[PDB]
Amino acid sequence: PEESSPRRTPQSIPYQDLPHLVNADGQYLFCRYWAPTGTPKALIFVSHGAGEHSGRYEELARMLMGLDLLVFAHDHVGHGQSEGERMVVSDFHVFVRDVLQHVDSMQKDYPGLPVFLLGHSMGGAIAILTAAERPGHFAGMVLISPLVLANPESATTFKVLAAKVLNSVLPNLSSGPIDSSVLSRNKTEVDIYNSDPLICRAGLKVCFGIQLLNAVSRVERALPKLTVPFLLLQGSADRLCDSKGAYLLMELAKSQDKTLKIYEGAYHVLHKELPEVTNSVFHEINMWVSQRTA
Ligand SMILES: *C(=O)N1CCC(N2C(=O)[C@H](c3ccccc3)[C@H]2c2ccccc2)CC1
């Protein structure tokens, strides 16, 4: 008997040449690490949003590593360089389970360190659910435009189409894709998003949209259990995650250490917005994590 051909990413790169982790379902997740030259003060997991991937966090990760944190991430199943049918998940909990496996694995290699989470959009719903599953385990969470409440006009349009796939057998159904111009007022960052071949810019598959509605439902039920410290950054003109969700998260979370910063006029991707906003986002995350790792 001979060993089968190396498992490769969806872009045909052997996983044996890349940092990776195999999840509970036997799926390979592509991993990224940014470690300081000294002994890290803390670990921080970066949780990307729907359709994107971990490579989009390069600059934020380098800033965090500059604070002597060991930053780590993986592409969620169905995204980027990880395995899985594109933007499909059997249940939304798979994302949370896989973050927990990676966090548990890193804490074995770097024991006794505080661990933080940083999430954007769906990645912020994943961070919230991860922290609610393990009360008292995480030192803090940084949320950038987390998915807590979808945009009201898009939630109504979807929930109707969703109950049509929920009543019949229609596997290939999909809604329309995101209008990339609403991601950011920074046109260069919108063009970069439109140029990245690791980003899935296809319309949302209805099955996946159902899992996002499950995520929103679960986030709402988790808020009375959420006690982790958090920093919440939200743009007032975000057409993807309505700002009303950020106010509801500040109100309903039980956390004793919660802070909200609103960026007036800003769109969704605050860490890739107009320079004045992006520089503030980086500075605020730096101060917030620096204060909680001293
Ligand atoms: C960050 O990762 N996200 C991706 C999903 C996106 N989104 C919602 O929220 C809407 C949704 C939610 C649940 C089921 C179906 C659709 C979509 C959306 C919003 C606005 C326009 C187009 C698509 C928020 C950001």
UniProtKB/Swiss-Prot annotation:
Record PTM Phosphothreonine, positions in chain: 9
Pathway participation: Glycerolipid metabolism; triacylglycerol degradation
A GO MF label: monoacylglycerol lipase activity
Gene3D superfamilies associated with the record: alpha/beta hydrolase (3.40.50.1820)
Topology of the protein relative to the lipid bilayer: Peripheral membrane protein
This protein's UniProt keywords: Cytoplasm, Fatty acid biosynthesis, Fatty acid metabolism, Hydrolase, Lipid biosynthesis, Lipid degradation, Lipid metabolism, Membrane, Nitration, Phosphoprotein, Serine esterase
GO biological process, one term: regulation of signal transduction
Tissue: Detected in adipose tissue, lung, liver, kidney, brain and heart.
Annotated compartments: Cytoplasm, Cytosol; Membrane
EC number: 3.1.1.23
Major localization class: cytoplasm
UniProt cross-references to PROSITE patterns, sorted A to Z: LIPASE_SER
Family: Belongs to the AB hydrolase superfamily. Monoacylglycerol lipase family.
Role description: Converts monoacylglycerides to free fatty acids and glycerol. Hydrolyzes the endocannabinoid 2-arachidonoylglycerol, and thereby contributes to the regulation of endocannabinoid signaling, nociperception and perception of pain. Regulates the levels of fatty acids that serve as signaling molecules and promote cancer cell migration, invasion and tumor growth.
Subunit comment: Homodimer.
Protein name: Monoglyceride lipase
Native source species: Homo sapiens (Human)
Name of encoding gene: MGLL
